[PDB]
Design a protein around this ligand. Structure first.
Ligand code: CLA
Ligand code: CLA
Ligand code: CLA
Ligand code: CLA
Ligand SMILES: C=Cc1c(C)c2cc3nc(c4c5[nH]c(cc6nc(cc1[nH]2)C(C)=C6CC)c(C)c5C(=O)[C@@H]4C(=O)OC)[C@@H](CCC(=O)OC/C=C(\C)CCC[C@H](C)CCC[C@H](C)CCCC(C)C)[C@@H]3C
Ligand SMILES: CCCCCCCCCCCCCCCCCC(=O)OC[C@H](CO[C@@H]1O[C@H](CO)[C@H](O)[C@H](O)[C@H]1O)OC(=O)CCCCCCCCCCCCCCCCC
Ligand SMILES: CCCCCCCCCCCCCCCCCC(=O)OC[C@H](CO[C@@H]1O[C@H](CO)[C@H](O)[C@H](O)[C@H]1O)OC(=O)CCCCCCCCCCCCCCCCC
Ligand SMILES: CCCCCCCCCCCCCCCC(=O)OC[C@H](CO[C@@H]1O[C@H](CS(=O)(=O)O)[C@@H](O)[C@H](O)[C@H]1O)OC(=O)CCCCCCCCCCCCCCC
Ligand SMILES: CCCCCCCCCCCCCCCC(=O)OC[C@H](CO[C@@H]1O[C@H](CS(=O)(=O)O)[C@@H](O)[C@H](O)[C@H]1O)OC(=O)CCCCCCCCCCCCCCC
Ligand SMILES: CC1=C(/C=C/C(C)=C/C=C/C(C)=C/C=C/C=C(C)/C=C/C=C(C)/C=C/C2=C(C)CCCC2(C)C)C(C)(C)CCC1
Ligand SMILES: CC1=C(/C=C/C(C)=C/C=C/C(C)=C/C=C/C=C(C)/C=C/C=C(C)/C=C/C2=C(C)CCCC2(C)C)C(C)(C)CCC1
Ligand SMILES: [Fe+2]
Lengths: 34, 346, 70, 59, 68, 490, 30, 30, 37, 35, 76, 31, 30, 37, 30
């Protein structure tokens, strides 16, 4: 079923969403600071 | 525009991103700056502390005695050969200090360098559209991208491994260059012979146009420091295109007459050179190399009197292959008696 | 029965943009820009078209017929 | 091919790639080509509009 | 001046008719970005499968697999 | 007037001539394929498929017909080992004549749309000028794209109405066109699964239809219009050049690495089957399958097929080629005539020695005789003056098992070197270098040539994506920038 | 000799040579 | 055979270099 | 039917003839060494 | 400003060329010194 | 503000970059001199290249099984 | 002070002084 | 096959073909 | 020196292009049977 | 080999005959 390979793979996409999401919440903090 | 649509959060973010500043961020800065910073920072980390003793079997760091010339972020071993070597992936499995030991810090730099070079080329687009210029600076930078992608990515994805990629170091390039002479005979591929003419031809247009302008200048100051006499907002030009035409027309025979065509010719000569050398590496990635001339290998086979410098080069390629490949390809586990390698005498 | 989430039968007004310049024997081929903000006019089913009769895809009278034939 | 033998025999006897003068000259032409591709791009990319679009920009 | 009118031209005429009409605002753009980010995750499935960077239990990815 | 490189932009304004040109380019591409097929079936040799196969003959468009189920000629021969009962109308000659009559049809349609370029279909209402509803015209083609994609999977691969696709065994020893059933689990993404191919076209066929009905009905946003510049005919060009080299890297990679869509018995083995020892872990596997019951060596090697000892030969590897070495692989080192049997190299004390194989890197690798354990015992040296490991001070003899030299011995100092040099190349063979006047140096399989073309084309199309991508965004300042742009000074 | 060697060269020379001559002769007659 | 095909293409290049100097399109000022 | 208003003319001045013919001959000097092998 | 710039660059430029001499000194001694 | 000339002349600049600068340098000295750098990255010390088992350069020759194999070749 | 220009300097200037502490101590490591 | 057979034909076709094209294209541009 | 007043122009209309190209191909159909023997 | 060279020159002649009928220079009166 689930493998150590796919467990680490689905750890990578949620790692990817925190980075791209954290940057998208970084500008929207700064751009609303004007 | 011109119908009063409202402003969304994305519109507000764009003004901060395309605000004039000491360094331009833009939208491409989100792709450029965290991918370019980790590339060279991942290069300086690997060349300083990270070994290569497990991958190739040779020291490559300042922490091992290698100087600036002999330090290199080395390619992974040929065991993996096409894995991306993720720090979470099955060849590493989360452990960082064992991830560097398998040469996986090479792929951290090569892959974060590729998305840097996409981002830097995108940087030249949105700055040009902001200042409303033409995109030819972006179009020239594709030729460094075609050299990067073909040599560092297409070539290992055609050969048997990431092992045979170049390593990000000074002397490590110097074996990759010497790899291609013995094992490929890369100096007789005409796609490299058109690469050289692009490089040496563009070096010649950098030296003439920089000197023709500098010696046909208009006397506009009175101090002999002639750099002082240039108000950059002036309507007239600073040198004499008529005189510069007649100089090379009588020195060389044919000269330029068109300042628009000239600087575009300086654009075309280096870009065509690298693009016609990215094609040659593609053939090497499949080992479709121009190694031999058939009608002279036959003639040298039957006659020990005929030779050229070509047949003298085929022996020297045998001297590179039969000698360095014992240590260069350690995964091949091969050893040589000192009688099986070709020599001359004494 | 008042069941319409997602606004699928809302009167969806449009805006029309003029065409741009191909005009190869000219100095600048500009852009298309905004001309008029028209309103949506559904269920004109004029029969000179014969392959697209209604004036609107998102018109309430067409989805009624599309619910029934389904 | 006569040149290509001279490049090989030279580096076998003298190791030209590990000499800083060959390192300067290599930077002399990689820098020289970059300074021609970059300069020649920006002059083309700042040309003033004087012709049509069917006619070439060199006119 | 007029063009030329054909039997098949009048038939396909309402297809090439509304050239210019757009939706105001943002439209379905946020819904479009959902399908891109899924399809980008879909390619990282079939790449890291085919790189053998993620290993599944029923594939084995060789020539033996093709023969049952 | 124009330069020589802007001559084809007279078409960019009016729609009607652009069909006429796109018909003319379509007439050539088909007319190539009809010409390439008739040229090649007139030079095809259906005699010896086990040993002078289709791929070694050096051949381009005929495996792409065989893969979708064309195995019979009007000449009456087949591929797999029989003759034609009846070829039917869709054969090698008939498909070849199918494209040419198609090409003469599309030639004439170009001539019509060139003369009657001015149609009321193109001049839109409420302006009366040449325009194209570029989003809605995409839905009409995207609908019909997946509809052909759905029809190909449900019928032509599944075998409900079409014939199926080519499916082999793992080792190329057999295989032909049968219908296959789609696989829907995680095995459908195994690229060596043929069931993933039929599963793909049914799944992606439906979604393209659903996307086709979407883009017909939903107009694009005004914010997304001006961003991607929807109102110009070239923003689709720069993206269609962008899409097609994403295709061409995928198509080149699955040819080079091998897939279920590139069977090895049509295109020849990869380079990754040589160096990984894919065949040597099968030949040695089947020897132990017949020595475990108990037999002689010449018994088990007599039971190994002649074909599987032919795939294990470095002269079939496409990476052992040359860029300017033209033509067939059979022009390289002759038509293969027969297999010459497995050589075995015995010491003076009878200890069997092993030949270090040649990697696909060095043009020539010097011969060696490793022992059972992997230590150099004998070799043909360079320096014959000082020599202690040479074979005449060792006494290596060669024995053949099957083939043509079945159960022979040689201790001759010339003949042992003459076969130990051949032992680097995998298995030993006999050829005839007088039939095609072969030169003796190898070439590359069409797996190797197809990979070269569709990377050089793809990496060139990357430049085409930039140039037309930069032309759409910077369209207003193509003719040179305006007078005053000095507003940008800080 | 490659029999197709000298005739792939000859077509490579003469066909783009004759291409550029046609464009030049119509130019200089203006 | 090819030894005379090579020398055609060498002196062919030297042909244009003669015509590109003395029969060039003369540049006209203003 | 109607005359097409997209009729443009193509030209190739003499200084471009010389870059053309010198392009073709030079790489024909280059590659012809390889075609005959 | 307060400090003149010219003896800022002299002190830094000495300590940069002072820093380079260590790496040449460390080339003949210690690791990689070939002994 | 700060046209980059006044930054390198002010005394508030040299009261900040005379303390954080050596503290960043001395911490860079300790990272290697305490042996920490050999273990946080994994390069072998000069008394650690050859163990008693192997007496030549290491070699992996297995793709998925490298993690436990390198830990044997490390002598650990 | 958190400026885009300041971060660009201190993203580079801070790790480079940390590394010059390393290489200078690498020169005094005996065999 | 005559090796010079197909290339004496090819030069016989292409060189007077390209001769007549040059005269026609300068004519139709008048 | 002086411009030559003998400058004449040469022309070849389309109905003469067709007699030219049909002349060349037809006797190339004729004689090519003999060149290959 | 020559069997395809012959068929080029046959259908080449039939090419002009197509172009000489439908794409002829139209004879304008007076
Ligand atoms: C935007 C800049 C950027 C880009 C383009 C990359 C790109 C890359 N990085 Mg780098 N990286 C970055 C920033 C970036 N990184 C930063 C800021 C850091 C510091 C934290 C790193 C640190 C880093 C390390 C340490 C490594 C990489 C690696 C990689 C590569 C693997 C990509 C991957 O697997 O992501 C996969 C994820 C995505 C592509 C995101 C897609 C978005 C998804 C699809 C949205 C859906 C989310 C959803 C909620 C998921 C639901 C799951 C649920 C069912 C549980 C790739 C070349 C690896 C590498 O170089 O390979 C050797 C590696 O080891 N990166
Ligand atoms: C789908 C492909 C495609 C299409 C439809 C176009 C269409 C266009 N291009 Mg683009 N282009 C493409 C691909 C494409 N291009 C690629 C891949 C590149 C990178 C090499 C370029 C680079 C490019 C540039 C740099 C320019 C164009 C220009 C043009 C315009 C006129 C072309 C012209 O006058 O050529 C005329 C062509 C000839 C007179 C003959 C050229 C001879 C070629 C080089 C070799 C012979 C052809 C070859 C044997 C056929 C093999 C085809 C191959 C695919 C197998 C037109 C809008 C021009 C433009 O936009 O200016 C307004 C322009 O300046 N294109
Ligand atoms: C029941 C569901 C189902 C199933 C079983 C399949 C089955 C399959 N699909 Mg399909 N697919 C489906 C639904 C399905 N599909 C749907 C609903 C969609 C959306 C329309 C698609 C869209 C789709 C696409 C777009 C592709 C597949 C592919 C595949 C194949 C698996 C991957 C493969 O062969 O690896 C081989 C392919 C890859 C590993 C893809 C590599 C992509 C790389 C990243 C591109 C590299 C280019 C890039 C620019 C780098 C160049 C520079 C570099 C050299 C440095 C297989 C036949 C792939 C295929 O064509 O197979 C050959 C593929 O590309 N599918
Ligand atoms: C009347 C229909 C028809 C049929 C049945 C055939 C049949 C054949 N042709 Mg012919 N051909 C036709 C029309 C046809 N052709 C036309 C009109 C042309 C002119 C363009 C050609 C040009 C042509 C050439 C040049 C060649 C063939 C070849 C072939 C053979 C194999 C085809 C193959 O494997 O392609 C496989 C096709 C693909 C891999 C394409 C996949 C689609 C790609 C990925 C594009 C997808 C983009 C699209 C937008 C998808 C998005 C939608 C999705 C999201 C839903 C086969 C005998 C080949 C052959 O063997 O030579 C004789 C060959 O070389 N044909
Ligand atoms: C070896 C030669 C070489 C180098 C070092 C080089 C360097 C550079 N050229 C640039 C530009 C250009 N160069 C151009 C044409 C050319 N450039 C050429 C050759 C070179 N160009 C040639 C031959 C041409 C002719 C076609 C153009 C047209 C431009 C520009 O416009 C551009 C510019 O604006 O310059 C100011 C800059 C790129 C900015 C950038 O992406 O940084 C960001 C950093 C990134 C994206 C990370 C790259 C990571 C790389 C790919 C891998 C990592 C490598 C390690 C960091 C270092 C390894 C070093 C070992 C080999 C010792 C930079 C100064
Ligand atoms: C993300 C997932 C995929 C989404 C793909 C969206 C593509 C379309 C985006 C809008 C394009 C557009 O309208 O440009 C249109 C705009 C122009 O926009 C117009 O500008 C005018 C200037 O006078 C006026 O100010 C107008 O008000 C303004 O609408 O072009 C740009 O300014 C440059 C856009 C650069 C591309 C941005 C792409 C964003 C991608 C990243 C998004 C996520 C970031 C966090 C991570
Ligand atoms: C168009 C007309 C104008 C140009 C005229 C032709 C000039 C160019 C000629 C083609 C290039 C030279 C090739 C060798 C010439 C030759 O003698 O061929 C001779 C060869 C035949 O070669 C012979 O073949 C025989 C049968 O196999 C025997 O095997 C003989 O031993 C063998 O010598 O003809 C070809 O193979 C030509 C095929 C070329 C098709 C492309 C192949 C490469 C695919 C990748 C494409 C790369 C694209 C890169 C883009 C950048
Ligand atoms: C070392 C040599 C080795 C062998 C050489 C072989 C060369 C082969 C390549 C030749 C390249 C020719 C390219 C085109 C030249 C051109 O456009 O000139 C244009 C000039 C224009 O000059 C114009 O002349 C005009 C005066 S007038 O009108 O002509 O009287 C004047 O108004 C104007 O300003 C002036 O520009 O035309 C001429 O005046 C001279 C005629 C040139 C055409 C003949 C060239 C071919 C014959 C060459 C010799 C035999 C070779 C055999 C093969 C053909
Ligand atoms: C059974 C077929 C077998 C294969 C056929 C192979 C044929 C090979 C030989 C072709 C002979 C061509 C001779 C010259 C023709 C000519 O001058 O036409 C002149 C006409 C003028 O028509 C003009 O057109 C004008 C309209 S417009 O301006 O063009 O829109 C109009 O004003 C005017 O009255 C009208 O005269 O030009 C055209 O309009 C059409 C373009 C013709 C040029 C392309 C011909 C070559 C491609 C042929 C197909 C591919 C073959 C591959 C080899 C090239
Ligand atoms: C990998 C990694 C990463 C990254 C990191 C980084 C990014 C780092 C950085 C780093 C850096 C950023 C570094 C830098 C460095 C620098 C240096 C080390 C320098 C040196 C120099 C020298 C030595 C010299 C100098 C000089 C010159 C130039 C000449 C003259 C003299 C003088 C002295 C002045 C991440 C996190 C992602 C993840 C984890 C891991
Ligand atoms: C009219 C008509 C007809 C006829 C038709 C025909 C006869 C057709 C043909 C067609 C054909 C017969 C075609 C052909 C084509 C060919 C081609 C199209 C080719 C191409 C090629 C190319 C393009 C190449 C390129 C290249 C080079 C140069 C070299 C190599 C590489 C490359 C690729 C680069 C009929 C009776 C049926 C009916 C109707 C009417
Ligand atoms: Fe300049």
């Amino acid at each position: 079923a689930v493998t150590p390979s796919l467990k680490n793979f689905l750890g990578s996409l949620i790692a990817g969403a925190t980075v791209l999401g954290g940057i998208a919440l970084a500008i929207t903090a700064v751009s609303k600071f004007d | 525009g011109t119908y009063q649509e409202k402003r969304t959060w994305f519109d507000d973010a764009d003004d901060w991103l395309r605000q004039d500043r000491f360094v331009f961020v833009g939208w491409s800065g989100l792709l450029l700056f965290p991918c370019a910073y980790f590339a060279l920072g991942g290069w300086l980390t690997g060349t300083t502390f990270v070994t290569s003793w497990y991958t190739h079997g040779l020291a490559t760091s300042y922490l091992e005695g290698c100087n600036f010339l002999t330090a290199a972020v080395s390619t992974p071993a040929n065991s993996m050969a096409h894995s991306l070597l993720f720090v979470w992936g099955p060849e590493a499995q989360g452990d960082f200090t064992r991830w560097c030991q398998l040469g996986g810090l090479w792929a951290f730099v090569a892959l974060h360098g590729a998305f840097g070079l996409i981002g830097f080329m995108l940087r030249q687009f949105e700055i040009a559209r902001s200042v409303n210029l033409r995109p030819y600076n972006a179009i020239a930078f594709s030729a460094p991208i075609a050299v990067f992608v073909s040599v560092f990515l297409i070539y290992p994805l055609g050969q048997s491994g990431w092992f045979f990629a170049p390593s990000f170091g000074v002397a490590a390039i110097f074996r990759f260059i010497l790899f291609f002479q013995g094992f490929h005979n890369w100096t007789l591929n005409p796609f490299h012979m058109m690469g050289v003419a692009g490089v040496l031809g563009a070096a010649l247009l950098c030296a003439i146009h920089g000197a023709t302008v500098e010696n046909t200048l208009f006397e506009d100051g009175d101090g002999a420091n002639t750099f002082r006499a240039f108000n950059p907002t002036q309507a007239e030009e600073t040198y004499s295109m008529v005189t510069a035409n007649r100089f090379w027309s009588q020195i060389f025979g044919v000269a330029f007459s068109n300042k628009r065509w000239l600087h575009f010719f300086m654009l075309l000569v280096p870009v065509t050179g690298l693009w016609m050398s990215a094609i040659g590496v593609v053939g090497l990635a499949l080992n479709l190399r121009a190694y031999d001339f058939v009608s002279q290998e036959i003639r040298a086979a039957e006659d020990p009197e005929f030779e050229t410098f070509y047949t003298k080069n085929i022996l020297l390629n045998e001297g590179i292959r039969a000698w360095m490949a014992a240590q260069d390809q350690p995964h091949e586990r091969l050893v040589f008696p000192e009688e099986v390698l070709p020599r001359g005498n004494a | 029965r008042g069941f319409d989430p997602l606004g699928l039968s809302k009167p969806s007004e449009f805006v029309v943009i003029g065409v741009d310049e191909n005009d190869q024997n000219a100095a600048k081929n500009n852009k298309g820009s905004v001309e008029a903000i028209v309103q949506a006019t559904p269920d004109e089913v004029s029969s000179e078209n014969r392959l697209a009769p209604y004036s609107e895809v998102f018109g309430l009278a067409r989805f009624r017929e599309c619910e029934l034939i389904h | 091919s006569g040149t290509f033998n001279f490049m090989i025999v030279f580096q076998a006897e003298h190791n030209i790639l590990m000499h800083p003068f060959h390192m300067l000259g290599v930077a002399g032409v990689f820098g020289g080509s970059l300074f021609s591709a970059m300069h020649g791009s920006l002059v083309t990319s700042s040309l003033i509009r004087e012709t049509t679009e069917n006619e070439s920009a060199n006119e | 001046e007029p063009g030329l009118v054909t039997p098949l031209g009048t038939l396909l005429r309402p297809l090439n008719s509304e050239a210019g009409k757009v939706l105001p605002g943002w439209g379905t753009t946020v819904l479009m970005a959902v399908f891109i980010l899924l399809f980008a995750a879909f390619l990282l499935i079939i790449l890291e499968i085919y790189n053998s960077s993620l290993i599944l239990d029923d594939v084995s990815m060789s020539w033996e697999t093709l023969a049952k | 007037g124009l330069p020589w490189y802007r001559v084809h932009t007279v078409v960019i304004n009016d729609p009607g001539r652009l069909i006429s040109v796109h018909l003319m380019h379509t007439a050539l591409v088909s007319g190539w394929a009809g010409s390439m097929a008739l040229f090649e079936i007139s030079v095809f040799d259906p005699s010896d498929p086990v040993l002078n196969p289709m791929w070694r003959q050096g051949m381009f468009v005929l495996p792409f017909m065989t893969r979708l189920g064309i195995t019979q000629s009007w000449g009456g021969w087949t591929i797999s080992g029989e003759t034609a009962t009846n070829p039917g109308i869709w054969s090698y000659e008939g498909v070849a004549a199918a494209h040419i009559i198609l090409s003469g049809a599309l030639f004439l349609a170009s001539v019509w749309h060139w003369t009657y370029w001015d149609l009321e279909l193109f001049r839109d209402p409420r302006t009366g000028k040449t325009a194209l509803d570029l989003p809605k015209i995409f839905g009409i083609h995207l609908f019909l794209s997946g509809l052909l994609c759905f029809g190909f999977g449900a019928f032509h691969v599944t075998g409900v109405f079409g014939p199926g696709i080519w499916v082999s065994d793992p080792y190329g020893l057999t295989g032909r066109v049968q219908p296959v059933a789609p696989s829907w689990g995680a095995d459908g993404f195994d690229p060596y699964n043929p069931g993933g191919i039929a599963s793909h076209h049914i799944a992606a066929g439906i979604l393209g239809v659903l996307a086709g009905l979407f883009h017909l009905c939903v107009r694009p946003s005004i914010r997304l219009y001006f961003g991607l510049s929807m109102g110009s005919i070239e923003t689709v060009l720069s993206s269609s050049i962008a899409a097609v080299f994403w295709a061409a890297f995928v198509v080149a990679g699955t040819m080079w690495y091998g897939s279920a869509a590139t069977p090895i018995e049509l295109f020849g083995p990869t380079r990754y089957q040589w160096d990984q020892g894919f065949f040597q872990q099968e030949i040695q596997k089947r020897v132990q399958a017949s020595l475990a019951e108990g037999a002689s060596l010449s018994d088990a090697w007599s039971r190994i097929p002649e074909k599987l000892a032919f795939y294990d030969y470095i002269g079939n590897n496409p990476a052992k080629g040359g860029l300017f070495r033209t033509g067939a692989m059979n022009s390289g080192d002759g038509i293969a005539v027969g297999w010459l049997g497995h050589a075995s190299f015995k010491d003076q004390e009878g200890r069997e020695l092993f030949v270090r194989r040649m990697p696909t890197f060095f043009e020539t690798f010097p011969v060696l005789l490793l022992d059972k354990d992997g230590i150099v015992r004998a070799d043909v040296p360079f320096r014959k003056a000082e020599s202690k490991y040479s074979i005449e001070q060792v006494g290596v003899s060669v024995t053949f098992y099957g083939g043509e030299l079945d159960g022979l011995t040689f201790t001759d100092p010339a003949t042992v070197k003459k076969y130990a040099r051949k032992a680097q190349l995998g298995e030993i063979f006999e050829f005839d270098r007088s039939t095609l006047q072969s030169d003796g140096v190898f070439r590359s399989s069409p797996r190797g040539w197809f990979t070269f073309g569709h990377v050089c084309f793809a990496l060139l199309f990357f430049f085409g994506h930039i140039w037309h991508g930069a032309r759409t965004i910077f369209r207003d300042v193509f003719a040179g920038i305006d007078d005053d742009i000095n507003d940008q000074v800080e | 000799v490659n029999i197709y060697g000298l005739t792939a060269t000859a077509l490579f020379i003469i066909i783009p040579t004759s291409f550029l001559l046609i464009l030049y002769v119509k130019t200089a007659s203006t | 055979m090819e030894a005379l095909v090579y020398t055609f293409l060498l002196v062919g290049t030297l042909g244009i270099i003669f015509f590109s100097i003395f029969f060039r399109d003369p540049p006209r000022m203003i | 039917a109607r005359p097409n208003p997209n009729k443009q003319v193509v030209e190739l001045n003499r200084t471009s003839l010389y870059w053309g013919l010198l392009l073709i001959f030079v790489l024909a000097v280059l590659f012809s060494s390889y075609i005959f092998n | 400003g307060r400090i003149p710039l010219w003896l800022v660059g002299t002190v830094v430029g000495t300590l940069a060329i002072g820093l380079l001499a260590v790496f040449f000194y460390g080339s003949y001694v210690g690791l990689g010194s070939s002994l | 503000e700060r046209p980059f000339s006044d930054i390198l002349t002010s005394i508030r600049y040299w009261v900040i970059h005379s303390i954080t600068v050596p503290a960043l340098f001395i911490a860079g000295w300790l990272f290697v001199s305490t042996g920490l750098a050999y273990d946080v990255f994994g390069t072998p010390r000069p008394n650690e290249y050859f163990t008693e088992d192997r007496q030549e350069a290491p070699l992996i020759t297995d793709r998925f099984n490298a993690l436990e194999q390198v830990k044997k070749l490390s002598g650990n | 002070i958190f400026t885009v220009r300041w971060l660009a300097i201190h993203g580079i200037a801070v790790p480079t002084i940390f590394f010059l502490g390393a290489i200078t101590a690498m020169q005094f490591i005996q065999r």
